[PDB]
mmCIF file of C-alpha atoms and ligand atoms in Angstrom:
data_model
loop_
_atom_site.group_PDB
_atom_site.id
_atom_site.type_symbol
_atom_site.label_atom_id
_atom_site.label_comp_id
_atom_site.label_asym_id
_atom_site.label_seq_id
_atom_site.Cartn_x
_atom_site.Cartn_y
_atom_site.Cartn_z
ATOM 1 C CA UNK A 1 105.367 95.750 135.261
ATOM 2 C CA UNK A 2 101.779 94.559 135.487
ATOM 3 C CA UNK A 3 98.565 95.512 137.233
ATOM 4 C CA UNK A 4 95.473 93.496 138.203
ATOM 5 C CA UNK A 5 92.286 95.080 139.538
ATOM 6 C CA UNK A 6 88.859 93.766 140.470
ATOM 7 C CA UNK A 7 85.869 95.221 138.633
ATOM 8 C CA UNK A 8 82.401 94.986 140.194
ATOM 9 C CA UNK A 9 78.873 95.567 138.859
ATOM 10 C CA UNK A 10 77.324 98.709 140.317
ATOM 11 C CA UNK A 11 73.812 97.167 140.716
ATOM 12 C CA UNK A 12 71.760 94.011 140.293
ATOM 13 C CA UNK A 13 71.389 94.603 136.531
ATOM 14 C CA UNK A 14 75.113 94.797 135.621
ATOM 15 C CA UNK A 15 74.381 98.326 134.347
ATOM 16 C CA UNK A 16 78.051 99.244 134.605
ATOM 17 C CA UNK A 17 81.215 98.051 136.272
ATOM 18 C CA UNK A 18 83.499 100.055 138.617
ATOM 19 C CA UNK A 19 87.189 99.511 139.296
ATOM 20 C CA UNK A 20 89.286 101.226 142.011
ATOM 21 C CA UNK A 21 91.868 103.745 140.849
ATOM 22 C CA UNK A 22 94.478 105.429 143.088
ATOM 23 C CA UNK A 23 95.177 109.066 142.187
ATOM 24 C CA UNK A 24 97.800 111.342 143.723
ATOM 25 C CA UNK A 25 100.162 111.312 146.662
ATOM 26 C CA UNK A 26 99.045 110.105 149.146
ATOM 27 C CA UNK A 27 96.695 107.972 147.052
ATOM 28 C CA UNK A 28 93.047 109.013 146.781
ATOM 29 C CA UNK A 29 91.001 105.939 145.825
ATOM 30 C CA UNK A 30 88.085 106.568 143.443
ATOM 31 C CA UNK A 31 85.860 103.966 141.710
ATOM 32 C CA UNK A 32 85.934 104.658 138.007
ATOM 33 C CA UNK A 33 84.060 103.175 135.036
ATOM 34 C CA UNK A 34 86.673 101.706 132.705
ATOM 35 C CA UNK A 35 85.410 102.600 129.238
ATOM 36 C CA UNK A 36 86.966 101.222 126.065
ATOM 37 C CA UNK A 37 84.594 103.561 124.106
ATOM 38 C CA UNK A 38 86.201 106.849 125.236
ATOM 39 C CA UNK A 39 89.616 108.241 126.025
ATOM 40 C CA UNK A 40 89.355 110.652 128.965
ATOM 41 C CA UNK A 41 90.266 109.919 132.599
ATOM 42 C CA UNK A 42 88.018 112.380 134.411
ATOM 43 C CA UNK A 43 86.898 112.537 138.016
ATOM 44 C CA UNK A 44 84.509 114.196 140.391
ATOM 45 C CA UNK A 45 86.638 116.718 142.226
ATOM 46 C CA UNK A 46 86.916 119.445 144.823
ATOM 47 C CA UNK A 47 86.363 121.735 141.795
ATOM 48 C CA UNK A 48 82.988 120.254 140.898
ATOM 49 C CA UNK A 49 80.014 122.523 141.517
ATOM 50 C CA UNK A 50 78.840 121.449 144.956
ATOM 51 C CA UNK A 51 75.172 121.054 144.045
ATOM 52 C CA UNK A 52 76.232 118.568 141.314
ATOM 53 C CA UNK A 53 78.106 116.326 143.730
ATOM 54 C CA UNK A 54 76.084 113.689 145.521
ATOM 55 C CA UNK A 55 80.537 110.271 144.984
ATOM 56 C CA UNK A 56 84.107 110.251 146.241
ATOM 57 C CA UNK A 57 86.051 113.264 144.951
ATOM 58 C CA UNK A 58 89.634 113.920 143.954
ATOM 59 C CA UNK A 59 91.223 116.993 145.609
ATOM 60 C CA UNK A 60 94.279 118.028 143.587
ATOM 61 C CA UNK A 61 95.538 120.393 146.332
ATOM 62 C CA UNK A 62 95.865 117.377 148.666
ATOM 63 C CA UNK A 63 98.196 115.617 146.250
ATOM 64 C CA UNK A 64 101.862 116.553 146.380
ATOM 65 C CA UNK A 65 102.395 115.147 142.850
ATOM 66 C CA UNK A 66 99.538 117.070 141.162
ATOM 67 C CA UNK A 67 100.568 119.708 138.581
ATOM 68 C CA UNK A 68 98.105 122.025 136.768
ATOM 69 C CA UNK A 69 98.448 121.583 132.990
ATOM 70 C CA UNK A 70 98.414 125.271 132.182
ATOM 71 C CA UNK A 71 95.875 126.416 129.646
ATOM 72 C CA UNK A 72 94.329 122.943 129.196
ATOM 73 C CA UNK A 73 90.593 122.320 129.293
ATOM 74 C CA UNK A 74 88.272 119.418 128.448
ATOM 75 C CA UNK A 75 84.614 118.812 127.608
ATOM 76 C CA UNK A 76 83.019 115.495 126.738
ATOM 77 C CA UNK A 77 79.584 114.108 125.936
ATOM 78 C CA UNK A 78 78.554 110.480 125.661
ATOM 79 C CA UNK A 79 76.151 108.526 123.479
ATOM 80 C CA UNK A 80 73.531 108.456 126.212
ATOM 81 C CA UNK A 81 73.627 112.283 126.311
ATOM 82 C CA UNK A 82 75.600 112.710 129.558
ATOM 83 C CA UNK A 83 78.491 115.245 129.788
ATOM 84 C CA UNK A 84 81.139 116.888 131.921
ATOM 85 C CA UNK A 85 83.938 119.450 131.570
ATOM 86 C CA UNK A 86 86.773 121.092 133.495
ATOM 87 C CA UNK A 87 90.515 121.656 133.777
ATOM 88 C CA UNK A 88 93.482 119.277 133.804
ATOM 89 C CA UNK A 89 96.146 118.126 136.231
ATOM 90 C CA UNK A 90 98.915 115.633 135.681
ATOM 91 C CA UNK A 91 99.365 113.255 138.624
ATOM 92 C CA UNK A 92 100.419 109.751 139.602
ATOM 93 C CA UNK A 93 97.730 107.151 138.856
ATOM 94 C CA UNK A 94 97.795 103.501 139.860
ATOM 95 C CA UNK A 95 95.478 100.693 138.769
ATOM 96 C CA UNK A 96 95.829 97.276 140.359
ATOM 97 C CA UNK A 97 99.402 97.952 141.421
ATOM 98 C CA UNK A 98 100.512 99.410 138.052
ATOM 99 C CA UNK A 99 101.690 103.022 138.512
ATOM 100 C CA UNK A 100 101.918 105.719 135.832
ATOM 101 C CA UNK A 101 103.452 109.126 136.556
ATOM 102 C CA UNK A 102 102.389 112.187 134.646
ATOM 103 C CA UNK A 103 98.874 110.911 133.802
ATOM 104 C CA UNK A 104 96.380 113.553 132.781
ATOM 105 C CA UNK A 105 93.597 113.625 135.376
ATOM 106 C CA UNK A 106 90.697 115.688 134.063
ATOM 107 C CA UNK A 107 89.085 117.427 137.030
ATOM 108 C CA UNK A 108 85.394 118.150 136.565
ATOM 109 C CA UNK A 109 84.165 121.662 137.163
ATOM 110 C CA UNK A 110 80.663 120.485 136.236
ATOM 111 C CA UNK A 111 78.884 117.163 135.592
ATOM 112 C CA UNK A 112 75.520 116.369 134.022
ATOM 113 C CA UNK A 113 72.557 115.111 135.963
ATOM 114 C CA UNK A 114 72.966 111.407 135.259
ATOM 115 C CA UNK A 115 76.450 111.576 136.768
ATOM 116 C CA UNK A 116 75.140 113.327 139.888
ATOM 117 C CA UNK A 117 72.379 110.729 140.187
ATOM 118 C CA UNK A 118 74.722 107.738 140.153
ATOM 119 C CA UNK A 119 76.403 107.555 143.498
ATOM 120 C CA UNK A 120 78.585 104.571 142.565
ATOM 121 C CA UNK A 121 80.595 106.078 139.676
ATOM 122 C CA UNK A 122 83.254 108.615 140.690
ATOM 123 C CA UNK A 123 84.407 109.221 137.088
ATOM 124 C CA UNK A 124 85.626 107.487 133.960
ATOM 125 C CA UNK A 125 88.897 105.896 132.854
ATOM 126 C CA UNK A 126 88.939 105.886 129.070
ATOM 127 C CA UNK A 127 90.678 103.042 127.238
ATOM 128 C CA UNK A 128 89.894 103.816 123.582
ATOM 129 C CA UNK A 129 92.623 105.363 121.428
ATOM 130 C CA UNK A 130 94.139 108.651 122.573
ATOM 131 C CA UNK A 131 92.968 110.422 119.391
ATOM 132 C CA UNK A 132 89.506 110.649 121.041
ATOM 133 C CA UNK A 133 90.771 112.474 124.135
ATOM 134 C CA UNK A 134 88.959 115.805 124.566
ATOM 135 C CA UNK A 135 91.705 117.900 126.197
ATOM 136 C CA UNK A 136 92.544 121.107 124.306
ATOM 137 C CA UNK A 137 94.756 122.507 123.007
ATOM 138 C CA UNK A 138 96.892 119.326 123.126
ATOM 139 C CA UNK A 139 95.179 115.957 123.582
ATOM 140 C CA UNK A 140 96.312 113.771 126.472
ATOM 141 C CA UNK A 141 97.254 110.093 126.486
ATOM 142 C CA UNK A 142 95.206 107.375 128.100
ATOM 143 C CA UNK A 143 96.379 105.457 131.163
ATOM 144 C CA UNK A 144 97.100 102.462 128.903
ATOM 145 C CA UNK A 145 99.144 104.500 126.426
ATOM 146 C CA UNK A 146 101.220 105.968 129.268
ATOM 147 C CA UNK A 147 101.730 102.518 130.794
ATOM 148 C CA UNK A 148 102.908 100.738 127.641
ATOM 149 C CA UNK A 149 106.583 101.618 127.973
ATOM 150 C CA UNK A 150 106.798 99.815 131.317
ATOM 151 C CA UNK A 151 104.289 96.975 130.807
ATOM 152 C CA UNK A 152 105.511 93.429 130.401
ATOM 153 C CA UNK A 153 103.427 93.345 127.167
ATOM 154 C CA UNK A 154 101.445 96.250 125.625
ATOM 155 C CA UNK A 155 98.075 94.667 126.362
ATOM 156 C CA UNK A 156 95.171 94.856 128.756
ATOM 157 C CA UNK A 157 92.417 92.279 129.271
ATOM 158 C CA UNK A 158 88.781 92.581 130.307
ATOM 159 C CA UNK A 159 87.127 89.681 132.181
ATOM 160 C CA UNK A 160 83.718 91.031 133.150
ATOM 161 C CA UNK A 161 81.407 88.944 135.331
ATOM 162 C CA UNK A 162 77.686 88.099 134.941
ATOM 163 C CA UNK A 163 76.301 89.441 138.194
ATOM 164 C CA UNK A 164 79.762 88.768 139.636
ATOM 165 C CA UNK A 165 83.156 90.433 140.201
ATOM 166 C CA UNK A 166 85.679 90.277 137.406
ATOM 167 C CA UNK A 167 89.135 91.517 136.483
ATOM 168 C CA UNK A 168 91.034 94.077 134.424
ATOM 169 C CA UNK A 169 94.663 93.075 133.867
ATOM 170 C CA UNK A 170 97.401 95.234 132.417
ATOM 171 C CA UNK A 171 100.564 93.849 130.849
ATOM 172 C CA UNK A 172 99.850 90.095 130.825
ATOM 173 C CA UNK A 173 97.423 87.432 129.668
ATOM 174 C CA UNK A 174 96.225 85.077 132.408
ATOM 175 C CA UNK A 175 96.065 81.714 130.653
ATOM 176 C CA UNK A 176 93.913 80.305 133.454
ATOM 177 C CA UNK A 177 91.137 82.859 132.923
ATOM 178 C CA UNK A 178 89.738 81.398 129.687
ATOM 179 C CA UNK A 179 89.118 78.107 127.900
ATOM 180 C CA UNK A 180 90.385 77.075 124.507
ATOM 181 C CA UNK A 181 92.547 79.603 122.764
ATOM 182 C CA UNK A 182 92.274 83.318 122.002
ATOM 183 C CA UNK A 183 91.342 84.245 118.416
ATOM 184 C CA UNK A 184 92.577 87.673 117.306
ATOM 185 C CA UNK A 185 90.921 89.935 114.756
ATOM 186 C CA UNK A 186 91.948 93.168 113.060
ATOM 187 C CA UNK A 187 91.171 96.561 114.533
ATOM 188 C CA UNK A 188 90.494 99.782 112.698
ATOM 189 C CA UNK A 189 91.385 102.957 114.611
ATOM 190 C CA UNK A 190 89.991 105.319 111.952
ATOM 191 C CA UNK A 191 87.203 106.384 114.353
ATOM 192 C CA UNK A 192 89.362 106.062 117.495
ATOM 193 C CA UNK A 193 87.599 102.931 118.793
ATOM 194 C CA UNK A 194 88.452 99.258 119.210
ATOM 195 C CA UNK A 195 86.513 98.745 115.989
ATOM 196 C CA UNK A 196 86.431 95.305 114.370
ATOM 197 C CA UNK A 197 84.313 93.199 112.046
ATOM 198 C CA UNK A 198 82.483 90.160 113.368
ATOM 199 C CA UNK A 199 82.140 87.359 110.804
ATOM 200 C CA UNK A 200 78.456 86.720 111.561
ATOM 201 C CA UNK A 201 76.030 85.338 114.094
ATOM 202 C CA UNK A 202 73.658 82.551 115.083
ATOM 203 C CA UNK A 203 70.529 82.552 117.224
ATOM 204 C CA UNK A 204 70.201 79.663 119.646
ATOM 205 C CA UNK A 205 70.716 76.296 117.985
ATOM 206 C CA UNK A 206 70.157 77.708 114.473
ATOM 207 C CA UNK A 207 72.456 78.432 111.590
ATOM 208 C CA UNK A 208 75.432 80.799 111.546
ATOM 209 C CA UNK A 209 74.844 83.584 109.009
ATOM 210 C CA UNK A 210 78.077 84.970 107.534
ATOM 211 C CA UNK A 211 77.138 88.633 107.391
ATOM 212 C CA UNK A 212 79.940 90.985 108.386
ATOM 213 C CA UNK A 213 79.098 93.215 111.366
ATOM 214 C CA UNK A 214 81.357 96.242 111.933
ATOM 215 C CA UNK A 215 81.200 97.318 115.530
ATOM 216 C CA UNK A 216 83.149 98.433 118.582
ATOM 217 C CA UNK A 217 84.258 96.564 121.732
ATOM 218 C CA UNK A 218 82.905 98.877 124.420
ATOM 219 C CA UNK A 219 83.111 98.071 128.126
ATOM 220 C CA UNK A 220 81.330 101.355 128.928
ATOM 221 C CA UNK A 221 78.076 100.348 127.152
ATOM 222 C CA UNK A 222 75.698 97.998 128.981
ATOM 223 C CA UNK A 223 73.924 96.262 126.096
ATOM 224 C CA UNK A 224 74.661 94.518 122.780
ATOM 225 C CA UNK A 225 73.543 96.821 119.919
ATOM 226 C CA UNK A 226 73.391 95.076 116.531
ATOM 227 C CA UNK A 227 71.774 95.646 113.143
ATOM 228 C CA UNK A 228 67.993 95.742 113.088
ATOM 229 C CA UNK A 229 67.751 92.584 110.936
ATOM 230 C CA UNK A 230 69.999 90.618 113.334
ATOM 231 C CA UNK A 231 68.107 91.782 116.403
ATOM 232 C CA UNK A 232 64.790 90.929 114.765
ATOM 233 C CA UNK A 233 66.079 87.426 113.993
ATOM 234 C CA UNK A 234 66.996 86.977 117.681
ATOM 235 C CA UNK A 235 63.683 88.147 119.161
ATOM 236 C CA UNK A 236 61.722 86.137 116.548
ATOM 237 C CA UNK A 237 62.797 83.132 118.632
ATOM 238 C CA UNK A 238 61.261 84.553 121.860
ATOM 239 C CA UNK A 239 57.509 84.106 121.701
ATOM 240 C CA UNK A 240 56.536 86.889 124.101
ATOM 241 C CA UNK A 241 59.040 89.439 122.802
ATOM 242 C CA UNK A 242 58.014 92.612 121.042
ATOM 243 C CA UNK A 243 59.392 96.049 120.383
ATOM 244 C CA UNK A 244 58.003 98.687 122.736
ATOM 245 C CA UNK A 245 57.878 102.190 121.416
ATOM 246 C CA UNK A 246 57.338 103.580 124.870
ATOM 247 C CA UNK A 247 59.969 101.557 126.798
ATOM 248 C CA UNK A 248 62.577 102.058 124.093
ATOM 249 C CA UNK A 249 63.387 98.570 122.792
ATOM 250 C CA UNK A 250 62.476 94.902 122.832
ATOM 251 C CA UNK A 251 60.719 93.667 125.953
ATOM 252 C CA UNK A 252 59.741 90.069 126.764
ATOM 253 C CA UNK A 253 58.262 88.033 129.662
ATOM 254 C CA UNK A 254 60.773 87.650 132.482
ATOM 255 C CA UNK A 255 59.815 83.971 132.729
ATOM 256 C CA UNK A 256 61.052 83.196 129.186
ATOM 257 C CA UNK A 257 63.963 80.842 128.763
ATOM 258 C CA UNK A 258 65.931 82.860 126.194
ATOM 259 C CA UNK A 259 68.040 81.360 123.410
ATOM 260 C CA UNK A 260 71.770 81.969 123.330
ATOM 261 C CA UNK A 261 73.323 84.364 120.812
ATOM 262 C CA UNK A 262 76.585 83.464 119.092
ATOM 263 C CA UNK A 263 78.888 85.916 117.331
ATOM 264 C CA UNK A 264 81.821 85.168 115.079
ATOM 265 C CA UNK A 265 85.440 86.194 115.639
ATOM 266 C CA UNK A 266 87.148 84.932 112.525
ATOM 267 C CA UNK A 267 86.463 81.202 112.481
ATOM 268 C CA UNK A 268 85.858 81.219 116.263
ATOM 269 C CA UNK A 269 82.527 81.572 118.025
ATOM 270 C CA UNK A 270 81.599 83.330 121.267
ATOM 271 C CA UNK A 271 78.356 82.119 122.810
ATOM 272 C CA UNK A 272 76.348 84.527 124.933
ATOM 273 C CA UNK A 273 74.112 82.428 127.261
ATOM 274 C CA UNK A 274 70.440 83.262 127.049
ATOM 275 C CA UNK A 275 70.191 84.517 130.585
ATOM 276 C CA UNK A 276 72.881 87.187 129.845
ATOM 277 C CA UNK A 277 70.326 88.627 127.395
ATOM 278 C CA UNK A 278 67.800 89.078 130.143
ATOM 279 C CA UNK A 279 68.850 92.548 131.225
ATOM 280 C CA UNK A 280 66.167 92.476 133.900
ATOM 281 C CA UNK A 281 62.704 93.650 134.880
ATOM 282 C CA UNK A 282 61.556 97.008 133.527
ATOM 283 C CA UNK A 283 60.802 97.851 137.159
ATOM 284 C CA UNK A 284 61.185 95.755 140.297
ATOM 285 C CA UNK A 285 58.450 93.123 140.331
ATOM 286 C CA UNK A 286 57.398 93.607 136.711
ATOM 287 C CA UNK A 287 56.480 90.616 134.645
ATOM 288 C CA UNK A 288 58.209 92.264 131.642
ATOM 289 C CA UNK A 289 61.940 92.350 131.148
ATOM 290 C CA UNK A 290 64.121 94.508 128.921
ATOM 291 C CA UNK A 291 66.208 92.730 126.305
ATOM 292 C CA UNK A 292 69.977 92.785 126.382
ATOM 293 C CA UNK A 293 70.204 92.733 122.546
ATOM 294 C CA UNK A 294 68.783 95.871 120.932
ATOM 295 C CA UNK A 295 68.903 97.541 117.516
ATOM 296 C CA UNK A 296 71.827 99.848 116.734
ATOM 297 C CA UNK A 297 69.718 101.893 114.301
ATOM 298 C CA UNK A 298 69.282 104.812 116.742
ATOM 299 C CA UNK A 299 72.897 105.001 117.806
ATOM 300 C CA UNK A 300 74.301 104.510 114.317
ATOM 301 C CA UNK A 301 77.121 102.120 115.212
ATOM 302 C CA UNK A 302 77.102 98.486 116.354
ATOM 303 C CA UNK A 303 78.313 98.118 119.938
ATOM 304 C CA UNK A 304 79.606 94.944 121.543
ATOM 305 C CA UNK A 305 78.843 96.189 125.050
ATOM 306 C CA UNK A 306 78.916 94.381 128.348
ATOM 307 C CA UNK A 307 76.208 91.786 127.462
ATOM 308 C CA UNK A 308 78.604 90.471 124.806
ATOM 309 C CA UNK A 309 81.948 91.155 126.484
ATOM 310 C CA UNK A 310 81.037 89.480 129.768
ATOM 311 C CA UNK A 311 80.621 86.182 127.853
ATOM 312 C CA UNK A 312 84.284 86.313 126.805
ATOM 313 C CA UNK A 313 87.827 86.918 127.945
ATOM 314 C CA UNK A 314 88.789 89.957 125.841
ATOM 315 C CA UNK A 315 92.328 90.991 124.943
ATOM 316 C CA UNK A 316 92.953 94.630 123.913
ATOM 317 C CA UNK A 317 96.319 94.310 122.155
ATOM 318 C CA UNK A 318 97.789 97.777 121.933
ATOM 319 C CA UNK A 319 100.785 97.035 119.842
ATOM 320 C CA UNK A 320 101.534 99.547 117.141
ATOM 321 C CA UNK A 321 99.098 97.724 114.915
ATOM 322 C CA UNK A 322 96.407 96.931 117.495
ATOM 323 C CA UNK A 323 94.252 93.785 117.476
ATOM 324 C CA UNK A 324 91.397 92.423 119.556
ATOM 325 C CA UNK A 325 91.297 88.895 120.959
ATOM 326 C CA UNK A 326 88.369 86.871 122.223
ATOM 327 C CA UNK A 327 88.286 83.580 124.117
ATOM 328 C CA UNK A 328 85.482 81.590 125.622
ATOM 329 C CA UNK A 329 85.519 81.273 129.415
HETATM 330 C C1 0QS B 401 70.410 101.734 131.316
HETATM 331 C C2 0QS B 401 70.854 101.763 129.829
HETATM 332 C C3 0QS B 401 69.407 101.985 129.123
HETATM 333 C C4 0QS B 401 71.193 100.277 129.460
HETATM 334 S S1 0QS B 401 71.982 103.043 129.217
HETATM 335 O O1 0QS B 401 72.385 102.958 127.815
HETATM 336 O O2 0QS B 401 71.722 104.446 129.684
HETATM 337 N N1 0QS B 401 73.485 102.553 130.277
HETATM 338 C C5 0QS B 401 74.572 103.363 129.895
HETATM 339 C C6 0QS B 401 75.774 103.079 130.861
HETATM 340 C C7 0QS B 401 75.448 103.513 132.294
HETATM 341 C C8 0QS B 401 75.049 102.576 133.215
HETATM 342 C C9 0QS B 401 74.820 102.921 134.554
HETATM 343 C C10 0QS B 401 75.053 104.217 134.928
HETATM 344 C C11 0QS B 401 75.413 105.185 134.016
HETATM 345 C C12 0QS B 401 75.637 104.831 132.677
HETATM 346 C C13 0QS B 401 75.158 103.163 128.481
HETATM 347 O O3 0QS B 401 75.286 101.987 128.057
HETATM 348 N N2 0QS B 401 75.614 104.245 127.845
HETATM 349 C C14 0QS B 401 76.290 104.125 126.556
HETATM 350 C C15 0QS B 401 75.186 104.339 125.571
HETATM 351 C C16 0QS B 401 75.520 104.571 124.164
HETATM 352 C C17 0QS B 401 76.592 104.306 123.419
HETATM 353 N N3 0QS B 401 76.340 104.785 122.152
HETATM 354 C C18 0QS B 401 75.126 105.348 122.152
HETATM 355 N N4 0QS B 401 74.624 105.217 123.362
HETATM 356 C C19 0QS B 401 77.376 105.183 126.495
HETATM 357 O O4 0QS B 401 77.095 106.395 126.269
HETATM 358 N N5 0QS B 401 78.634 104.759 126.689
HETATM 359 C C20 0QS B 401 79.789 105.654 126.860
HETATM 360 C C21 0QS B 401 80.352 105.551 128.297
HETATM 361 C C22 0QS B 401 79.401 105.695 129.470
HETATM 362 C C23 0QS B 401 78.786 107.088 129.525
HETATM 363 C C24 0QS B 401 77.891 107.218 130.728
HETATM 364 C C25 0QS B 401 78.664 106.941 132.028
HETATM 365 C C26 0QS B 401 79.208 105.490 131.955
HETATM 366 C C27 0QS B 401 80.072 105.422 130.703
HETATM 367 C C28 0QS B 401 80.891 105.280 125.828
HETATM 368 O O5 0QS B 401 82.034 106.077 126.009
HETATM 369 O O6 0QS B 401 81.181 103.894 125.962
HETATM 370 C C29 0QS B 401 80.549 105.536 124.360
HETATM 371 F F1 0QS B 401 81.396 104.854 123.587
HETATM 372 F F2 0QS B 401 79.337 105.103 124.072
HETATM 373 C C30 0QS B 401 80.685 107.008 123.999
HETATM 374 O O7 0QS B 401 79.778 107.795 124.286
HETATM 375 N N6 0QS B 401 81.838 107.345 123.476
HETATM 376 C C31 0QS B 401 82.235 108.726 123.281
HETATM 377 C C32 0QS B 401 83.279 108.857 122.183
HETATM 378 N N7 0QS B 401 83.537 110.275 121.948
HETATM 379 C C33 0QS B 401 84.029 110.454 120.557
HETATM 380 C C34 0QS B 401 84.426 111.827 120.314
HETATM 381 O O8 0QS B 401 85.601 112.041 121.153
HETATM 382 C C35 0QS B 401 85.092 112.041 122.500
HETATM 383 C C36 0QS B 401 84.704 110.653 122.777
#
């Protein structure tokens, strides 16, 4: 089997991307943030404290296929400080026409304020490795892990758009969605992520520096977070750019024509166009824009988030020894 679903930016800044997910019988359609940096499928629900709901909710008692997973609970927090917790059902879940039975659906009893505040995100669908799942006492498998037995190939692909709709595919590689060929690189699962080592980088039309960059492919992070020295080298080529203590990163004049940023995948190169690195105005109508490449020093891990991923066609190869593929597009 295969599935193919459209993923859409939630706002004008490409802050996040949502993808429809059908849960239960009859199907309840929720828009979830597909997140290759975590491993829980959790939803706003009829269980969620009412004052914390502003979203479409899952009601397990309206689904004939929902089963309570007795004794199971979950609690998660994210790098940006947000959190949620609750209890666990198994139910039928479909993405893009691909159906899994027995998927753990983590029903939120409570959600943090940033979740309440974002009307567009009805929950998360984690796509990192199942070892990061937060259900206790027994961790639960991701949607991808449960799908692998039936998929035509144990893969999924991310084709995120720049201010445009894009696609998540499960079980096949669409050869018409990219140019050139895919280059694969090794993945370490020791921290539960799609963690890999980039072979280096270049700024604009300058030289490629072969300094290894260990980081994670994370569709649930907006920006590209790289080592301080790399980020400094990038913004050195932007004459109005400076680090802003108060705003929380590099800011630059919105009228700048930004250089591209190239990262290495083995011998291959993925080029992020300059305008992808313009995240957007600090506030509507500002003359200052926030950079899309920021230092990873505060977060402690390099993150190839959406600014990077949306420049590529990305293959998450979940064979027993997983790998990550990148192609230009
Ligand atoms: C506006 C912004 C200044 C650019 S922002 O950083 O706040 N944008 C958010 C995404 C967002 C956009 C719009 C609406 C709501 C949320 C962002 O990029 N958050 C990252 C920031 C980050 C990463 N690292 C340090 N900081 C994040 O937490 N991403 C997680 C998923 C997000 C959470 C908020 C809701 C949307 C999904 C994440 O899962 O990708 C993660 F990898 F960063 C992470 O937190 N992974 C958790 C892994 N744990 C390990 C232990 O086992 C449990 C799982």
